[PDB]
Design a binder for this molecule. Structure first.
Ligand SMILES: [Ca+2]
Lengths: 555, 555, 555
């Protein structure tokens, strides 16, 4: 019988073109399921896949506003090529120019309004803060919109969504474990987060990843996590991902209470990823609320155990790039954190906002940030942290008085760049382990090794060692100078060696009668001027510590 | 009826073993298409896939010289495992030894000639420049060869080629958008570029990527782009890729006019990638022609708007590694660029050749490059740029007079390595933001903090602060010395503190009668020698600025 | 005839549910093979796939202790979703606490014993060394266990295993070439290595990679190689991989003789990867045995050609992260190596153990390692190497006398961090290419530029340049001080400029009659005390080099 042989030798796949509803096709499926016609779904339409391990291959669109809900997929199920699209074409704003300059003026942003499923985003309430005054100026038809076409995977284990795309599209994993969003094929976002792992009910989320791929646009954050804990195994997070033009942030771990419980996250990886042109932040990896925080943490550690911003979040954070944020490039909180290899460039707000304590930051580069003076500084650290390697300043100038680094409880080593030293505030700055040193000077007739005591003055060097050309180039002659500040005049007092190639030391003397207390150490002398005789005298502290006054030079 | 049920329950796939031509199989296909026998194609053979969204699975070879042309594939089509192979076995050169040393002598290169589809490449005209004299020495049968077996995807949107391989193989996307070359499985290249996105006609290319994978050999560049613009979204470029032994360069964005229009590229990503042993360059990301440039840019911005090498290319460039180039490791041009985290090692030409202006380079490492003295320097920057963090020198020495960095308009901070300071040329070099410092000296009886004024001398230190051992190790005693250059003799003039553990300052004096102009500042004195009385005198500039001469020390 | 049309239009797949043995299903398969029921295999069960190019899709478990052996798969075959599981539930140890602190006490480790297929590992003989005393304390039923369920690919070319997982699971490629383990889906390991490329027989392994994915647990190493050589093309190794909690090491290239031949490896890539919480080492990339080494290298280069630890291994090593090792973070040997961009944090043994010679290390960060004092240092280098950029110290203190870096034959530049300078030992340390410098001091009333001659003292600075506040903050006045050590008392002897805002130089003098030899240079004077007359004298070395004694200051 051919049918016996056929049933044994051919691959099983059901296809949607043979069925009137998606549930009918799902029920028929045994191995493969092919989406080979566009399918209009109603919001909340729910498909039961019977616990089957299905390979779902999409070659057409799921069309609808609201959520298409997939349930009871077997472990190992895979959904490839899915394409979500809204039925509604909403009003979107586009707060950047044709030369990719951010628009900050509310009226200019309102002028960008158009009806489109892409190239912009639907305003939300956070836009009222981001573009002050815009709430009053937006037409009512552009406020409070709620358009997203969302694929919801509900309460499944071991399901992977690969190469997803769409228009006004979102992807929600609700109450899932060991699920992955892999190689997202640049979906264009809607009102809700583009990729969400939300585990507010049931067990803490674990094994949930965004791996590879990219997203564009969306009103809020591109990739986000609520109530996930990767365990000590660090089994979850974001690796190899790119976010472009998030309406809020590129990658976000939620903070505070959502509903009746914690939305926070522990033990996730954030590695090898890039966020470009977010309207708010590149990476927002905080767990506690900054402004107007909850007095408790239902479902999480109490404030009595860990103070605000001091949770043992224990994320693995490495090799991240942010460029072009209108908000903050990289933000986090927590205690006992290690963070490495972070690069932030060209952000309008702070490059880094770090509400961290007893944490270590290694090889950080913050290059041309706070370019619009939105924050007090380019990098802020609240608690007692360590920074080992910090690159500051690209090519931008700073006209006002804002600090570059304000990390008042932190100890820092290894700053590089053309930082204005008056714009550094740290607890301690040191290079303990340098070798033999050479200061090489270009474009000047001198070289300098300067000292600045910030307690005395943040703006004036307190002393210096200089080398200065005698005559011109090629003269083979220079003079060395040791200086000290007096009367807030840098270099006011100095000793010289070889000025005008004289081969001698020029020694400063006290310009009047020296007081007893002017001399510091025993077996030393201090020259001073006696004008009434045209003589140099010496105040001498003898080897035995007693003072005597001698005549040093006479007419 | 079984046939009704069978048509509903089984996956559709056509296979080439059932058809006499590839077009017949393509026409029959509805979902899958299996290449299950080797297929000999003629150059220019064109397959029309009818707009169908096909999953093409290759388990055999496409064999032929020239192009196999795929057209009218539906968005979402995928081609996996394709294997291209030429019919011709050409003559190839192998310009490296069994110890992986580059051959540079033309006669030695000619001696490597063999007929093979791999382990070398077909000479092209660029080899005549790379190996001077080789044009005369190559036998005629090894010149002007043109063997490539090329899969051409023509005027398609949303097509992905995955896990491709081959021998004398190339992959061309001509007039395509939103197409990807994913996880290339080490094809061995032919005469043409291995992976090309060419958009000289139609709309500018966008959404075109090389993601993952690797290539080997080829006569010209491994991955290349013509007339692509990723948009502000940076939707295209090269991520996660490895090139080995390109006959020209690993990754190339074309420069200048090709045909009648621009071949240039904007807004692409070049990230997380590696180029090893290219015959020419690792990354060639320039857009304007260097030698003998066009006087115009048909199809692009005019020279009147942006001068040569000053286009707003706006690529996203980060986390690149190059090793073993016979040419330049990393090259680019453009204005307003940000570049980060570039590592270049062991190149025979310059590590970096940067025809850039108003651009920022952060965390650059150029380690043992220009090892064959092909260029004037290891890193060159033409325009007014900023470098923040620059590692120079591995373990190689430099016998001649070539510069290490020549960046005469650039401001630089954060050099590390055993650079010869005479081989640094920059506009300005500074460490503005160091903390308290310690110079730790090993393998010497002294420690040093030296100063060098490059305007005075690039080769001689102009002054120093030294600490020198008194006696031997463990003596608990050292002397401190402040020095200045005179008569081109470093350290010619000095003041000492604690020489021979004497607990005193040794002060240099003018060895003859001091001229009036030798003293600089008021309320200072300058000792000088009066030989005719065996006396020290003091030239004194009094507190009121007037000069007087006093007797300082007498018999 | 429908059967003719059906045979042409449907995809071929055989499925295990239709057959009594795996061999029966394999024999029936032509294109696809679906594993759609759990399959109990016996150890050594061998399947012959007839040279067919098969796409094997797994949606169920292979269950058994021992090896399931796949042979004669055609080039291009793929195995997806495989899940290996043992029949035995062994006794496992879990040497870490509920706060993720390592357990080091043998009795505490024994107390963790449980029967499970995961969340720990089976003890092996290396545990007897790691937890001293544990050999005596372990119950007999927890010693010498040998449970692994291993998929063995034997003597195949061009086979890829994708998205594999399991419990007590291993994956062995024995005598294979051009094979890949791709996107491992966190298999939980057993007694043997989780991913092994072993080529002890036949040709040296080539083209063998681990790409992407992750593993957890296992008694020994996560990914390992024996007798592989990637060629100059670097065609093999580990890229994009994560290892968690290896019972030995994350990534290992074997050392020494195994059986009758070499187990060593050449020309592999180790890039873009992460190892966390290994019981032994993060990356172990050595080739020669350290303790009690072989006197020969059968099958490899003789000791007469390359001494122990000086093989030309030529691996491409870049962009690696290790955190939380109980052993060493990063270890290797070899001569002529280049290594870049390595980050190691929070390891109980050395961050790096480098038995390397004539090798270059660029941009290395070793942050809070040797935290349990297991080794003599945080980073060790035996041979004559170069280090360009080395970050040391996070937030941990060191109570004892151990060194931070011991690299006694190496030349180093670019240390950053709060290193204790007495804990640096190198051949030479230098910053040759710094610009104009500023020392910025926070939290002190002074700024300092110190000098330390390690030959004199590793613990005491030998001289200094200080700037000190006169009075208080905002006074606009400081004094500069130049000091030298005497009698092992830092700063014992000093010259001051502007002490107490006096505008003069305080000059130290010899406290008794100066000996002739106390003066160094011609045309200099040295003041000294004559107590019997209350006078300063000057020992003068005249311009002609002859000595004279003069009266300098008198009552
Ligand atoms: Ca006198």
């Amino acid at each position: 019988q051919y049918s016996i042989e056929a049933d044994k030798k051919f691959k099983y796949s059901a296809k949607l073109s043979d069925y009137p509803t998606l549930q009918d096709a799902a029920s028929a499926a045994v191995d493969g399921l092919l989406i080979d016609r566009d399918y209009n779904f109603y919001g909340g339409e729910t498909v039961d896949f019977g616990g089957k391990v299905l390979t779902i291959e999409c070659k057409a669109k799921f069309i609808g506003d609201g959520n298409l809900i997939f349930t009871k997929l077997g472990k190992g199920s895979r959904i490839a090529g899915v394409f979500m699209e809204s039925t509604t074409t909403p009003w979107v704003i586009k707060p950047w120019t044709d030369d990719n300059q951010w628009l900050t003026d509310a009226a200019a942003v309102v002028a960008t309004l158009k009806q489109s499923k892409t190239d912009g985003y639907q305003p939300t309430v956070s836009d009222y803060v981001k573009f002050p005054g815009i709430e009053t100026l937006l037409p009512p038809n552009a406020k409070g919109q709620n358009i997203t076409s969302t694929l919801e995977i509900r309460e499944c284990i071991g399901v992977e969504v690969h190469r997803a795309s769409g228009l006004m599209a979102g992807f929600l994993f609700r109450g899932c474990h060991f699920c992955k969003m892999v190689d997202a094929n640049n979906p264009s976002g809607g009102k809700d987060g583009i990729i969400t792992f939300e585990n507010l009910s049931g067990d803490w989320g674990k094994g949930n990843y965004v791996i590879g791929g990219r997203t564009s646009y969306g009103s809020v954050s591109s990739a986000q996590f609520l109530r996930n804990n990767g365990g000590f195994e660090r089994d979850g997070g974001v690796i190899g991902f790119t976010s472009y033009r998030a309406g809020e942030s590129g990658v976000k771990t939620w903070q505070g209470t959502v509903g009746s419980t914690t939305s926070r996250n522990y033990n996730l990886q954030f590695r090898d990823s890039v966020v470009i042109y977010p309207v708010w932040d590149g990476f927002d990896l905080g767990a506690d609320t900054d402004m107007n925080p909850e007095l408790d943490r239902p479902g999480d550690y109490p404030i009595t155990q860990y103070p605000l911003h001091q949770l043992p979040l224990n994320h693995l954070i490495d090799n991240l790039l942010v460029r072009g944020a209108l908000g903050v490039g990289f933000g986090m909180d927590g205690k006992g954190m290690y963070v490495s290899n972070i690069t932030v460039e060209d952000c309008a707000g702070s490059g880094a906002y770090l509400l961290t304590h007893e944490s270590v930051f290694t090889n950080i580069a913050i290059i041309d940030t706070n370019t619009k003076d939105f924050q007090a500084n380019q990098i802020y650290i609240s608690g007692a942290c360590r920074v080992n390697g910090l690159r500051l300043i690209g090519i931008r100038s700073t006209d006002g008085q804002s600090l570059t680094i304000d990390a008042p409880n932190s100890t820092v080593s290894g700053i590089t760049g053309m930082v204005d030293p008056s714009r550094i505030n740290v607890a301690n700055l040191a290079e303990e382990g340098l070798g033999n040193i050479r200061a090489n000077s270009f474009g000047y007739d001198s070289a300098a090794i300067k000292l600045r005591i910030h307690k005395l003055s943040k703006t004036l060097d307190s002393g210096a060692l200089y080398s200065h050309i005698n005559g011109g180039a090629g003269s083979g002659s220079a003079y060395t100078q040791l200086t000290a500040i007096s009367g807030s005049t840098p270099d006011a007092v100095s000793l010289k060696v070889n000025h005008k190639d004289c081969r001698g030391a020029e020694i400063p003397f006290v310009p009047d009668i020296a007081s007893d207390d002017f001399i510091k150490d025993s077996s030393c002398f201090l020259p001073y001027w006696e004008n009434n005789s045209t003589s140099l005298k010496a105040l001498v502290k003898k080897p035995n510590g007693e003072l005597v006054r001698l005549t040093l030079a006479t007419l």
